[PDB]
mmCIF file of C-alpha atoms and ligand atoms in Angstrom:
data_model
loop_
_atom_site.group_PDB
_atom_site.id
_atom_site.type_symbol
_atom_site.label_atom_id
_atom_site.label_comp_id
_atom_site.label_asym_id
_atom_site.label_seq_id
_atom_site.Cartn_x
_atom_site.Cartn_y
_atom_site.Cartn_z
ATOM 1 C CA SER A 1 -13.859 -4.965 80.514
ATOM 2 C CA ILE A 2 -10.434 -3.554 79.962
ATOM 3 C CA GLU A 3 -8.118 -1.839 82.419
ATOM 4 C CA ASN A 4 -4.644 0.079 81.492
ATOM 5 C CA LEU A 5 -2.689 -0.887 84.922
ATOM 6 C CA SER A 6 0.693 0.546 83.997
ATOM 7 C CA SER A 7 2.524 2.759 81.625
ATOM 8 C CA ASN A 8 6.212 3.318 81.430
ATOM 9 C CA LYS A 9 8.185 5.277 78.894
ATOM 10 C CA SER A 10 10.913 3.038 77.488
ATOM 11 C CA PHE A 11 13.288 4.044 74.561
ATOM 12 C CA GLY A 12 10.888 6.722 73.337
ATOM 13 C CA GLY A 13 8.089 4.341 73.347
ATOM 14 C CA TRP A 14 5.764 2.952 75.810
ATOM 15 C CA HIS A 15 5.559 -0.298 77.853
ATOM 16 C CA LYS A 16 1.815 -0.807 79.108
ATOM 17 C CA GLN A 17 0.255 -3.500 80.994
ATOM 18 C CA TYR A 18 -3.484 -4.503 80.946
ATOM 19 C CA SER A 19 -6.211 -6.538 82.526
ATOM 20 C CA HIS A 20 -9.318 -7.460 80.824
ATOM 21 C CA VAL A 21 -11.991 -10.194 81.048
ATOM 22 C CA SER A 22 -11.106 -13.070 79.015
ATOM 23 C CA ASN A 23 -14.003 -15.020 77.214
ATOM 24 C CA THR A 24 -11.979 -18.006 76.253
ATOM 25 C CA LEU A 25 -10.324 -18.233 79.758
ATOM 26 C CA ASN A 26 -13.364 -16.933 81.732
ATOM 27 C CA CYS A 27 -11.329 -14.944 84.054
ATOM 28 C CA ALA A 28 -9.269 -11.797 84.580
ATOM 29 C CA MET A 29 -6.037 -12.020 82.590
ATOM 30 C CA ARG A 30 -3.148 -9.845 82.235
ATOM 31 C CA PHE A 31 -0.874 -9.101 79.328
ATOM 32 C CA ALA A 32 1.806 -6.472 78.472
ATOM 33 C CA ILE A 33 2.681 -4.599 75.324
ATOM 34 C CA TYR A 34 5.428 -2.594 74.022
ATOM 35 C CA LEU A 35 4.530 0.108 71.378
ATOM 36 C CA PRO A 36 7.457 1.571 69.473
ATOM 37 C CA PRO A 37 7.839 5.321 68.963
ATOM 38 C CA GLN A 38 6.291 4.888 65.625
ATOM 39 C CA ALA A 39 2.856 3.847 67.124
ATOM 40 C CA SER A 40 2.723 7.650 68.416
ATOM 41 C CA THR A 41 2.868 8.942 64.769
ATOM 42 C CA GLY A 42 -0.254 7.616 63.309
ATOM 43 C CA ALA A 43 1.613 4.558 61.830
ATOM 44 C CA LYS A 44 0.408 1.029 62.200
ATOM 45 C CA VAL A 45 3.118 -1.322 63.330
ATOM 46 C CA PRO A 46 3.620 -5.155 63.026
ATOM 47 C CA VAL A 47 3.248 -7.352 66.240
ATOM 48 C CA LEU A 48 5.596 -9.973 67.677
ATOM 49 C CA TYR A 49 3.675 -12.068 70.311
ATOM 50 C CA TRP A 50 6.171 -13.361 72.930
ATOM 51 C CA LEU A 51 5.323 -16.487 74.942
ATOM 52 C CA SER A 52 6.979 -16.835 78.232
ATOM 53 C CA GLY A 53 8.146 -20.072 79.930
ATOM 54 C CA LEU A 54 7.428 -21.843 83.342
ATOM 55 C CA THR A 55 6.730 -19.629 86.533
ATOM 56 C CA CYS A 56 6.891 -16.308 84.241
ATOM 57 C CA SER A 57 4.010 -13.593 84.316
ATOM 58 C CA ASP A 58 3.409 -11.087 81.477
ATOM 59 C CA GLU A 59 6.260 -9.020 82.598
ATOM 60 C CA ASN A 60 9.425 -11.067 82.757
ATOM 61 C CA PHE A 61 10.512 -10.538 79.205
ATOM 62 C CA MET A 62 9.533 -6.872 78.901
ATOM 63 C CA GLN A 63 11.751 -6.252 82.073
ATOM 64 C CA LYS A 64 14.701 -8.669 81.394
ATOM 65 C CA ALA A 65 14.979 -9.311 77.716
ATOM 66 C CA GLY A 66 16.162 -5.934 76.614
ATOM 67 C CA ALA A 67 14.082 -6.182 73.555
ATOM 68 C CA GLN A 68 12.762 -2.516 73.682
ATOM 69 C CA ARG A 69 15.645 -0.602 72.273
ATOM 70 C CA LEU A 70 15.782 -2.648 68.782
ATOM 71 C CA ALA A 71 12.121 -2.896 68.730
ATOM 72 C CA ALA A 72 11.959 0.679 68.868
ATOM 73 C CA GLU A 73 14.421 1.129 66.063
ATOM 74 C CA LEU A 74 12.651 -1.513 63.819
ATOM 75 C CA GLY A 75 9.040 -0.045 64.641
ATOM 76 C CA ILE A 76 7.714 -3.592 66.139
ATOM 77 C CA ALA A 77 5.042 -3.818 68.762
ATOM 78 C CA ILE A 78 5.667 -6.837 71.382
ATOM 79 C CA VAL A 79 2.836 -8.292 73.006
ATOM 80 C CA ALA A 80 3.527 -10.572 76.042
ATOM 81 C CA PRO A 81 0.445 -12.564 77.617
ATOM 82 C CA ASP A 82 0.605 -14.220 80.877
ATOM 83 C CA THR A 83 1.525 -17.976 80.898
ATOM 84 C CA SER A 84 -1.711 -19.072 82.599
ATOM 85 C CA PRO A 85 -5.018 -17.743 83.963
ATOM 86 C CA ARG A 86 -4.627 -16.632 87.299
ATOM 87 C CA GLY A 87 -6.596 -15.932 90.638
ATOM 88 C CA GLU A 88 -8.185 -17.819 93.510
ATOM 89 C CA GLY A 89 -11.080 -18.662 91.187
ATOM 90 C CA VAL A 90 -8.609 -20.560 88.987
ATOM 91 C CA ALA A 91 -7.224 -24.003 89.563
ATOM 92 C CA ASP A 92 -3.641 -24.186 90.588
ATOM 93 C CA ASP A 93 -0.895 -26.775 91.818
ATOM 94 C CA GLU A 94 2.110 -26.208 94.295
ATOM 95 C CA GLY A 95 4.592 -27.269 91.810
ATOM 96 C CA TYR A 96 6.360 -24.727 89.686
ATOM 97 C CA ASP A 97 5.611 -26.877 86.571
ATOM 98 C CA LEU A 98 1.783 -27.332 86.607
ATOM 99 C CA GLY A 99 -1.204 -24.918 87.048
ATOM 100 C CA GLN A 100 -0.659 -21.152 87.526
ATOM 101 C CA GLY A 101 2.575 -19.840 85.684
ATOM 102 C CA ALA A 102 2.422 -23.248 83.539
ATOM 103 C CA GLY A 103 -0.611 -23.387 81.126
ATOM 104 C CA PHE A 104 1.631 -24.940 78.444
ATOM 105 C CA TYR A 105 -0.266 -23.329 75.835
ATOM 106 C CA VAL A 106 -3.010 -25.998 75.514
ATOM 107 C CA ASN A 107 -6.632 -26.224 75.745
ATOM 108 C CA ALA A 108 -6.991 -28.302 78.823
ATOM 109 C CA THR A 109 -9.949 -31.083 78.543
ATOM 110 C CA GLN A 110 -9.702 -32.439 81.913
ATOM 111 C CA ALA A 111 -11.070 -31.458 85.127
ATOM 112 C CA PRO A 112 -10.670 -29.138 87.011
ATOM 113 C CA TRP A 113 -8.166 -27.293 84.586
ATOM 114 C CA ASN A 114 -10.690 -27.286 81.431
ATOM 115 C CA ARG A 115 -12.764 -24.679 83.278
ATOM 116 C CA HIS A 116 -10.027 -21.783 82.670
ATOM 117 C CA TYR A 117 -7.038 -23.443 81.070
ATOM 118 C CA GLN A 118 -7.742 -22.598 77.347
ATOM 119 C CA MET A 119 -4.358 -20.985 76.590
ATOM 120 C CA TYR A 120 -4.092 -22.060 73.123
ATOM 121 C CA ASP A 121 -7.591 -20.497 72.312
ATOM 122 C CA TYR A 122 -6.527 -17.515 74.272
ATOM 123 C CA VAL A 123 -3.202 -16.765 72.300
ATOM 124 C CA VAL A 124 -4.319 -17.902 68.809
ATOM 125 C CA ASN A 125 -7.860 -16.434 68.634
ATOM 126 C CA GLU A 126 -8.912 -14.046 71.527
ATOM 127 C CA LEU A 127 -5.512 -12.004 72.279
ATOM 128 C CA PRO A 128 -4.827 -11.161 68.591
ATOM 129 C CA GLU A 129 -8.348 -9.875 68.190
ATOM 130 C CA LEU A 130 -8.137 -7.704 71.242
ATOM 131 C CA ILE A 131 -4.725 -6.237 70.453
ATOM 132 C CA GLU A 132 -5.767 -5.308 66.692
ATOM 133 C CA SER A 133 -8.820 -3.502 67.874
ATOM 134 C CA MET A 134 -7.091 -1.568 70.716
ATOM 135 C CA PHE A 135 -3.678 -0.504 69.170
ATOM 136 C CA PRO A 136 -2.332 0.925 65.947
ATOM 137 C CA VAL A 137 -1.061 -2.318 64.572
ATOM 138 C CA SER A 138 -1.433 -3.942 61.248
ATOM 139 C CA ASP A 139 -2.322 -7.483 60.780
ATOM 140 C CA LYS A 140 1.106 -8.702 60.245
ATOM 141 C CA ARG A 141 2.329 -10.862 63.307
ATOM 142 C CA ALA A 142 4.858 -13.306 64.279
ATOM 143 C CA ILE A 143 5.563 -15.187 67.290
ATOM 144 C CA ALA A 144 8.272 -16.354 69.618
ATOM 145 C CA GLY A 145 9.052 -17.905 73.011
ATOM 146 C CA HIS A 146 11.337 -19.366 75.550
ATOM 147 C CA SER A 147 11.128 -22.972 77.084
ATOM 148 C CA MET A 148 7.544 -23.720 77.662
ATOM 149 C CA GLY A 149 6.816 -20.547 75.523
ATOM 150 C CA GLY A 150 9.166 -21.666 72.826
ATOM 151 C CA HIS A 151 7.009 -24.941 72.824
ATOM 152 C CA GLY A 152 4.052 -22.603 72.571
ATOM 153 C CA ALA A 153 5.541 -20.455 69.731
ATOM 154 C CA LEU A 154 6.452 -23.357 67.742
ATOM 155 C CA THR A 155 3.488 -25.400 67.961
ATOM 156 C CA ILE A 156 1.203 -22.375 67.645
ATOM 157 C CA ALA A 157 3.146 -21.273 64.534
ATOM 158 C CA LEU A 158 3.204 -24.746 62.879
ATOM 159 C CA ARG A 159 -0.552 -25.070 63.403
ATOM 160 C CA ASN A 160 -1.497 -21.869 62.149
ATOM 161 C CA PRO A 161 1.162 -21.127 59.405
ATOM 162 C CA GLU A 162 -1.104 -18.667 57.369
ATOM 163 C CA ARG A 163 -1.353 -16.383 60.510
ATOM 164 C CA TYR A 164 2.272 -16.004 61.447
ATOM 165 C CA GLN A 165 4.934 -14.617 59.124
ATOM 166 C CA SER A 166 7.647 -16.182 61.162
ATOM 167 C CA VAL A 167 8.526 -17.978 64.568
ATOM 168 C CA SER A 168 11.324 -18.228 66.698
ATOM 169 C CA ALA A 169 12.386 -19.602 70.265
ATOM 170 C CA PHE A 170 14.963 -19.639 72.887
ATOM 171 C CA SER A 171 15.537 -23.143 74.594
ATOM 172 C CA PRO A 172 12.007 -24.530 73.427
ATOM 173 C CA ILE A 173 10.556 -27.877 74.744
ATOM 174 C CA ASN A 174 10.637 -29.448 71.187
ATOM 175 C CA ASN A 175 9.566 -32.992 71.940
ATOM 176 C CA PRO A 176 6.930 -32.553 75.081
ATOM 177 C CA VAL A 177 5.582 -35.823 74.763
ATOM 178 C CA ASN A 178 8.791 -37.388 75.436
ATOM 179 C CA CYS A 179 10.115 -35.346 78.766
ATOM 180 C CA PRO A 180 8.818 -35.005 82.127
ATOM 181 C CA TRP A 181 7.666 -31.515 81.961
ATOM 182 C CA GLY A 182 5.468 -32.154 79.023
ATOM 183 C CA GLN A 183 4.226 -35.459 80.231
ATOM 184 C CA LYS A 184 3.297 -34.164 83.736
ATOM 185 C CA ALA A 185 1.422 -31.129 82.135
ATOM 186 C CA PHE A 186 -0.208 -33.234 79.353
ATOM 187 C CA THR A 187 -1.483 -35.869 81.614
ATOM 188 C CA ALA A 188 -2.908 -33.371 83.940
ATOM 189 C CA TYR A 189 -4.444 -31.045 81.336
ATOM 190 C CA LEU A 190 -5.099 -33.396 78.419
ATOM 191 C CA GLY A 191 -5.486 -36.807 80.149
ATOM 192 C CA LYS A 192 -4.060 -40.333 79.702
ATOM 193 C CA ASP A 193 -4.640 -40.650 76.061
ATOM 194 C CA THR A 194 -1.487 -39.964 74.729
ATOM 195 C CA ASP A 195 -2.948 -39.694 71.241
ATOM 196 C CA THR A 196 -4.468 -36.177 72.094
ATOM 197 C CA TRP A 197 -0.818 -34.978 72.947
ATOM 198 C CA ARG A 198 0.332 -35.202 69.405
ATOM 199 C CA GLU A 199 -1.147 -31.767 68.235
ATOM 200 C CA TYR A 200 0.778 -30.042 70.802
ATOM 201 C CA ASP A 201 4.463 -31.311 70.103
ATOM 202 C CA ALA A 202 6.499 -29.094 68.195
ATOM 203 C CA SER A 203 8.619 -31.901 66.731
ATOM 204 C CA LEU A 204 5.747 -34.151 65.782
ATOM 205 C CA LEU A 205 4.077 -30.998 64.314
ATOM 206 C CA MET A 206 7.182 -30.137 62.310
ATOM 207 C CA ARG A 207 7.400 -33.616 61.012
ATOM 208 C CA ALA A 208 3.717 -33.329 59.740
ATOM 209 C CA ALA A 209 3.794 -29.759 58.267
ATOM 210 C CA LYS A 210 2.417 -29.045 54.899
ATOM 211 C CA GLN A 211 2.965 -25.387 55.094
ATOM 212 C CA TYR A 212 6.063 -23.781 56.486
ATOM 213 C CA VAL A 213 6.814 -20.894 58.812
ATOM 214 C CA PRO A 214 10.485 -19.882 58.765
ATOM 215 C CA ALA A 215 12.013 -20.734 62.133
ATOM 216 C CA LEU A 216 14.888 -19.609 64.032
ATOM 217 C CA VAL A 217 15.758 -21.569 67.309
ATOM 218 C CA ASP A 218 18.685 -20.431 69.570
ATOM 219 C CA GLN A 219 19.902 -23.007 72.391
ATOM 220 C CA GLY A 220 22.457 -22.532 75.128
ATOM 221 C CA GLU A 221 24.934 -25.321 75.403
ATOM 222 C CA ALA A 222 25.360 -24.900 78.962
ATOM 223 C CA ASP A 223 21.464 -25.099 79.559
ATOM 224 C CA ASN A 224 20.836 -27.796 82.211
ATOM 225 C CA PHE A 225 17.677 -28.828 80.807
ATOM 226 C CA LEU A 226 19.032 -29.498 77.426
ATOM 227 C CA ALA A 227 18.970 -33.396 77.263
ATOM 228 C CA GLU A 228 16.154 -34.081 79.536
ATOM 229 C CA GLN A 229 13.367 -31.340 78.763
ATOM 230 C CA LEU A 230 14.659 -29.591 75.559
ATOM 231 C CA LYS A 231 15.910 -32.040 72.947
ATOM 232 C CA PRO A 232 16.978 -29.423 70.132
ATOM 233 C CA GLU A 233 18.424 -32.668 68.279
ATOM 234 C CA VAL A 234 14.905 -33.970 67.909
ATOM 235 C CA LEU A 235 13.735 -30.433 66.376
ATOM 236 C CA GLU A 236 16.632 -30.825 63.879
ATOM 237 C CA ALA A 237 15.700 -34.358 62.979
ATOM 238 C CA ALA A 238 12.150 -33.348 62.399
ATOM 239 C CA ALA A 239 13.038 -30.588 60.122
ATOM 240 C CA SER A 240 15.436 -32.701 58.001
ATOM 241 C CA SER A 241 12.837 -35.130 57.501
ATOM 242 C CA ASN A 242 10.257 -32.639 56.068
ATOM 243 C CA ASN A 243 12.260 -29.956 54.220
ATOM 244 C CA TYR A 244 11.398 -27.703 57.223
ATOM 245 C CA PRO A 245 12.926 -23.901 57.100
ATOM 246 C CA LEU A 246 14.648 -24.241 60.500
ATOM 247 C CA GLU A 247 17.690 -22.666 61.566
ATOM 248 C CA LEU A 248 18.898 -23.939 64.897
ATOM 249 C CA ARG A 249 21.944 -22.126 66.454
ATOM 250 C CA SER A 250 23.717 -23.571 69.508
ATOM 251 C CA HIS A 251 25.814 -21.269 71.843
ATOM 252 C CA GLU A 252 28.785 -22.438 73.829
ATOM 253 C CA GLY A 253 28.615 -21.411 77.644
ATOM 254 C CA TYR A 254 25.114 -19.928 77.357
ATOM 255 C CA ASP A 255 22.406 -21.192 79.824
ATOM 256 C CA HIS A 256 18.610 -21.279 80.131
ATOM 257 C CA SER A 257 18.165 -17.821 81.682
ATOM 258 C CA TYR A 258 17.188 -14.321 80.232
ATOM 259 C CA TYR A 259 20.930 -13.534 80.346
ATOM 260 C CA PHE A 260 21.053 -15.899 77.209
ATOM 261 C CA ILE A 261 17.946 -14.353 75.635
ATOM 262 C CA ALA A 262 18.942 -10.791 76.171
ATOM 263 C CA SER A 263 22.152 -11.765 74.650
ATOM 264 C CA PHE A 264 20.612 -12.915 71.118
ATOM 265 C CA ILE A 265 17.279 -11.407 71.451
ATOM 266 C CA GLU A 266 18.302 -8.611 68.877
ATOM 267 C CA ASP A 267 18.994 -11.247 66.101
ATOM 268 C CA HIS A 268 15.390 -12.534 66.627
ATOM 269 C CA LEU A 269 13.949 -8.972 66.110
ATOM 270 C CA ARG A 270 15.888 -8.672 62.951
ATOM 271 C CA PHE A 271 14.611 -12.101 61.891
ATOM 272 C CA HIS A 272 11.111 -11.493 62.669
ATOM 273 C CA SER A 273 11.409 -7.805 61.039
ATOM 274 C CA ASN A 274 12.546 -9.392 57.828
ATOM 275 C CA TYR A 275 9.111 -11.316 57.498
ATOM 276 C CA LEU A 276 6.809 -8.859 59.190
ATOM 277 C CA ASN A 277 7.562 -6.342 56.644
HETATM 278 BR BR1 LIG B 301 9.850 -22.761 80.766
#
């Protein structure tokens, strides 16, 4: 039911990849975890769930964000699920922005996607239960993500305020119902009734929030998707209209890539550490 696929020592801790049979997704799923040195001592550590964006697997962040050095210093485990169900038994699309590598962290209601694309239930319910039963971790968790994953982290935190201590994102899709990436995915996964899309839009959820999770968002000003897909100003508007504890930082010259993420990921870890402990 569970297989450890790889184990790589990293800054005194361990990066480990797993495969398991997911009950929510009804298929084999891969996730990666980074266990800091503290995990080898008997201590329990907090967990930051990291949600990746379009076309990513469970490994991109682990390999490219350079989060391990500070995670090891702070004693924080990081768990990175895949971005969709995977396999020939799972529906796909030829486009980078639909299907595999593109689950959008929603529970699909439309055929043929609904058979396996239950990524919201996976990240919110199944994965944390698995993590906490396998690893020396406490029940303190936070969540973060990039782009499609930034959309994932914000929506999931906003909808589950009592479960997450803090949330952050790089370049999130803030207002998916109003951009092509979100409209294409939601139409496919959720259908044409745009009313059902509302619970999966970070900006709408932030406007509606009754409970707050402290939020940190970083956006690169040289990000080519900023105006058409991401719309940080819409998230700022939502926050201002609902007393929301959001800090949104804009960075000149920085883009959408992991070069941007790596340049600021330490701020995120320190932010999450503040609330995890
Ligand atoms: Br993305």
